[PDB]
Write a protein that binds this ligand. Structure first.
Ligand SMILES: *[C@@H]1O[C@H](CO[C@@H]2O[C@@H](C)[C@@H](O)[C@@H](O)[C@@H]2O)[C@@H](O[C@@H]2O[C@H](CO)[C@@H](O[C@@H]3O[C@H](CO)[C@@H](O)[C@H](O[C@H]4O[C@H](CO)[C@@H](O)[C@H](O)[C@@H]4O)[C@@H]3O)[C@H](O)[C@H]2NC(C)=O)[C@H](O)[C@H]1NC(C)=O
Ligand SMILES: CC(C)CCC[C@@H](C)[C@H]1CC[C@H]2[C@@H]3CC=C4C[C@@H](OC(=O)CCC(=O)O)CC[C@]4(C)[C@H]3CC[C@]12C
Ligand SMILES: CC(C)CCC[C@@H](C)[C@H]1CC[C@H]2[C@@H]3CC=C4C[C@@H](OC(=O)CCC(=O)O)CC[C@]4(C)[C@H]3CC[C@]12C
Ligand SMILES: *[C@@H]1O[C@H](CO)[C@@H](O[C@@H]2O[C@H](CO)[C@@H](O)[C@H](O)[C@H]2NC(C)=O)[C@H](O)[C@H]1NC(C)=O
Ligand SMILES: *[C@@H]1O[C@H](CO)[C@@H](O[C@@H]2O[C@H](CO)[C@@H](O)[C@H](O)[C@H]2NC(C)=O)[C@H](O)[C@H]1NC(C)=O
Ligand SMILES: N[C@@H](CCCC[NH3+])C(=O)O
Lengths: 223, 546
């Protein structure tokens, strides 16, 4: 029968950071989840600068002077200055510009590693501390030069908006790192979404490759 | 072109002169600008690098001045030791250094005085005279700086000399003010200003276009730290006054290097303390543009302290200013007396017994540069000129250490593994060629390390290959220079690691030069073109050695 279905994307702490809803039969609606990469980082690892921010919190950082709202007291010009010296993170609008640049550059990007649902072999990759992959070749999706793909992976993650689209949203001080997550044929067959599943998304940069843990789960209520 | 020429103050006095000249605009005005724009709290580190480079050059001078019995500027030593073209380049760079130092210190002092009295002079300048060229020329022409330079040039022409007593008194006042600044910063300032985050990225004033960086100790990254160090190298300039003055010294060749090193270390300590105080009392992005130290004191509630600083700065900026204005004509006169520059600059007035024409010309040029260009532009121009001069002197020391005592075909065995115990002409030629190749390779490394910095990070094959090959070949050439025997001629003072230390000094100086913006490089290129035009049109033919 038809239920009010809702797909929730949760941070590493399994707290709902994003959600979509609709009236559909169970296991028949598979929308393109579009959570922000920063929303996954809310109350996440300290690198992203949102370790103390609660889910659904407003984007931190002062507005860019180039934003649609125009100049204001305390507005930042970092959003126009070169981003080469900035760290890719979500604590400020210019840091979000740098994160978008890192996530869109061909030589860089992000790779997502399966977690609990992964097979025993993939279990060798590592635990959540390593974002479910401490060794190369453990990523099933994400935007990188080698373009990983797995038949048994439940989801595929990519950048929802291009750099040109994302820059303006960043300058507005809004969340501007959306991630398009699409359920795979294997994921659609899976009916354990109610329990929820977890992945680890790591940036492909020069260094530790900072990452976070996110999850997807399904709820349904009477229509 | 290569023609060479035939050639009491206590150590504490030399230290006082060096501290007086060195301390000034660099700490009282530029410290806040670097803290706000280039590096944040990491400005404390920016000075450190700029200090070490300043030390590396200074040590070379100790040897460079040790080779010439007659004390004087680096132009004197170069024209005695290496030749005529190199001496002209060094003297031209020193002339640029002195002129632009006069201009920049006059700017900083005029701005400080104008702010002290409520910025009426700057307001009048904006009201009645705007250059209208923000990109290149200054938005506000500093007429007061022109007046100051005119007054001081008039004083110098009429025979006013260096009052060592006044210099000592002003240096003592400035050092007391700097100590007060350090103590007030450590009392009122807090470490929290070095740990700012996006929660604190809000200057409660109504300013806009504020660069908040990443926050923390190093908001703008190590690239910003290096840019700040290149800018702060300006602050350590002026220690050359000890040798330049030419007044009799109790132990010239031994006191001069010791005095230079002591002055550099004292200035480094003062700059470190004052910059730490400035960045701890007030956020780096909150620092006042016009008056960083008085602004920080006002932020902490010690508003009246602006007067105390207003004294100390106006003292230091005075002693610093003369520190550039007194040597400024002398070098020209020397270059005019040796025939490299126009002979009319060497003319001495009967009434004053001073090079009136040279002083007037240098003062007019400095006044024009102050009228047209911003403080930071002049600072960077002087920094690039001074860095080139320092690198040239370091190369001079490196080359001369291996040359045989003055009055092509080669073999691999003699180059790699010479067996002569003392240098020969062949060894000197090998060392000269190695120095030229090493300078070219260091320039290549610095170019790749700055222009190709992202390319090196990106790991592109060409950039990494060029970097690795250039570094390995630099090491190889430095080794070739190592294998050659050093001249056994005794020297009063020597560079401890003359085959490595001068190379490191050259590398650091060139790298800092690369950090400067394109406008500074263009201005420096135009100045060098003018110098070469004068040399090859007039210098060669009218040289007294001809
Ligand atoms: C179909 O179901 C969805 C989702 O169901 C919700 O989650 C389930 C797990 C369960 O707990 C349900 O009980 C629960 O409703 C419904 O969409 C939610 O609707 C409620 C209100 O009915 C929203 O509650 C909040 O109410 C606040 C005022 O009291 C308001 O400020 C909130 O807005 C802010 O917060 C939300 C996220 O909570 C954010 O998206 C907004 O932009 C804003 O910041 C919010 O309105 C829930 O937020 C709704 N969404 C979710 C994921 O819970 C839907 O109404 C229902 N439809 C039908 C026809 O039944
Ligand atoms: C006075 C004697 C006893 C000691 C002399 C020591 C110097 C030769 C050392 C000390 C610190 C060194 C500097 C420390 C840091 C750097 C930055 C380095 O470049 C980077 O690391 C760039 C990184 C980036 O791209 O962000 C280039 C060399 C340099 C200038 C070093 C050059 C050599 C220096 C001046
Ligand atoms: C109506 C006009 C004249 C108002 C402008 C203010 C003047 C009274 C100022 C402008 C320049 C000032 C001079 C700038 C610098 C100095 C050098 C200073 O001495 C040193 O710095 C000594 C150090 C050394 O010799 O190295 C003594 C004051 C003096 C002459 C200042 C005296 C006061 C002057 C003339
Ligand atoms: C993510 O990508 C989707 C797909 O393009 C975006 O949805 C578009 O939104 C614009 C403006 O809202 C519409 O004009 C398009 O018709 C939409 N396309 C589709 C296929 O629906 C979406 O805006 C992007 N951002 C987020 C946060 O989802
Ligand atoms: C930067 O902002 C943070 C948070 O706004 C400040 O930290 C708080 O400061 C208040 C003082 O008003 C204290 O009562 C809180 O206990 C502090 N909390 C935390 C988590 O630090 C911080 O002091 C600010 N820093 C500066 C230099 O102003
Ligand atoms: N280093 C000097 C500037 C150049 C030399 C002036 N005597 C200062 O900080 O004031």
């Amino acid at each position: 029968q038809v239920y009010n279905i809702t797909w929730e994307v949760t941070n590493g702490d399994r707290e709902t950071v994003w959600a979509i809803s609709g009236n559909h039969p169970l296991w028949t609606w598979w929308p393109v989840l579009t959570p922000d990469l920063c929303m996954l980082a809310l109350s996440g690892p300290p690198h992203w600068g949102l370790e103390y921010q609660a889910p659904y919190s407003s984007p931190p950082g002062p507005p860019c002077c180039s934003g649609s709202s125009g100049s204001s007291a305390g507005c930042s010009r970092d959003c126009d200055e070169p981003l080469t010296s900035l760290t890719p993170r979500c604590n400020t609008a210019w840091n979000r510009l740098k994160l978008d640049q890192v996530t869109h550059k061909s030589s860089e990007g992000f790779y997502v590693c399966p977690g609990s649902h992964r097979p025993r072999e993939a279990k060798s990759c590592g635990g959540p501390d390593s974002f479910y992959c401490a060794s190369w070749g453990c990523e099933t999706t994400g935007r990188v030069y080698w373009k990983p793909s797995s038949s048994w992976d439940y989801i595929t993650v990519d950048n929802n908006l291009t750099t040109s689209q994302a820059v303006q949203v960043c300058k507005d001080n809004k969340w501007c790192n959306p991630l398009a997550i699409q359920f795979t044929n294997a994921g659609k067959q899976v009916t354990s979404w109610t329990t929820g599943h977890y992945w680890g998304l790591r940036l492909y940069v020069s260094g530790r490759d900072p990452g976070l843990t996110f999850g997807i789960r399904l709820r349904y209520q009477n229509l | 072109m290569l023609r060479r020429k035939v050639v009491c103050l206590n150590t504490y006095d030399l230290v006082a002169l060096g501290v007086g000249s060195t301390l000034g605009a660099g700490v009282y005005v530029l410290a806040g600008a670097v803290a706000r724009e280039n590096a944040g709290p990491a400005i404390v580190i920016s000075f450190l690098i700029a200090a070490l480079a300043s030390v590396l050059a200074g040590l070379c001078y100790g040897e460079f001045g040790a080779r010439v019995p007659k004390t004087g500027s680096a132009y004197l030593y170069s024209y005695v030791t290496v030749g005529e073209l190199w001496a002209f380049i060094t003297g031209w760079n020193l002339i640029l250094s002195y002129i632009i130092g006069t201009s920049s210190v006059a700017r900083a002092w005029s701005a400080t005085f104008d702010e002290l009295i409520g910025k009426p002079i700057g307001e009048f300048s904006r009201q009645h005279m705007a250059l209208n060229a923000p990109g290149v020329l200054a938005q506000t022409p500093d007429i007061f700086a022109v007046i100051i330079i005119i007054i001081l040039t008039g004083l110098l022409t009429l025979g006013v000399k260096e009052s060592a007593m006044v210099n000592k008194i002003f240096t003592c006042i400035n050092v007391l003010v700097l100590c007060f600044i350090v103590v007030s910063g450590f009392v009122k300032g807090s470490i929290k200003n070095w740990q700012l985050t996006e929660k604190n990225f809000s200057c409660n004033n109504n300013d806009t276009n504020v660069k908040y960086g990443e926050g923390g100790f190093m908001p703008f990254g190590f690239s910003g730290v290096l840019s700040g160090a290149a800018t702060c190298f300006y602050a350590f300039v002026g220690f050359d006054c000890i040798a330049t003055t030419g007044e009799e010294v109790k132990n010239p060749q031994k006191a001069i290097p010791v005095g230079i090193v002591a002055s550099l270390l004292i200035c480094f300590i003062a700059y470190f303390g004052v910059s730490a105080a400035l960045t701890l009392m007030m956020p780096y992005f909150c620092l006042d543009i016009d008056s960083p130290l008085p602004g920080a004191f006002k932020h902490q509630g010690w508003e009246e302290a602006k007067y105390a600083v207003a004294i100390g700065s106006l003292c230091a900026l005075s002693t610093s200013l003369l520190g550039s204005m007194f040597p400024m004509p002398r070098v020209i006169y020397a270059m005019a007396e040796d025939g490299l520059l126009f002979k009319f600059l060497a003319k001495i007035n009967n009434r004053t017994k001073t090079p009136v024409i040279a002083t007037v010309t240098s003062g007019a040029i400095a006044a024009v540069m102050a009228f047209l260009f911003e403080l930071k532009d002049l600072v960077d121009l002087m920094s690039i000129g001074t860095l080139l001069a320092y690198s040239l002197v370091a190369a001079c020391v490196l080359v001369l250490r291996y040359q045989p005592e003055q009055p092509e075909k080669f073999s691999l065995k003699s180059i790699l593994s010479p067996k002569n115990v003392e240098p020969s002409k062949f060894s000197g030629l090998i060392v000269n060629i190695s120095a030229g190749l090493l300078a070219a390779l260091i320039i290549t490394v610095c170019i790749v390390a700055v222009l190709g910095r992202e390319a090196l990070a990106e790991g592109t094959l060409w950039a990494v290959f060029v970097m690795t090959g250039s570094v390995l070949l630099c090491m190889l050439v430095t080794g070739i220079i190592w294998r050659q025997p050093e001249s056994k001629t005794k020297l009063s003072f020597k560079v401890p690691f003359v085959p490595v230390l001068p190379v490191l000094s050259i590398f650091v100086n060139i790298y800092l030069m690369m950090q400067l913006d394109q406008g500074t490089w263009v201005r420096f290129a135009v100045w060098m073109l003018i110098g070469f035009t004068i040399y090859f049109g007039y210098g060669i033919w009218h040289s007294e050695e001809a």
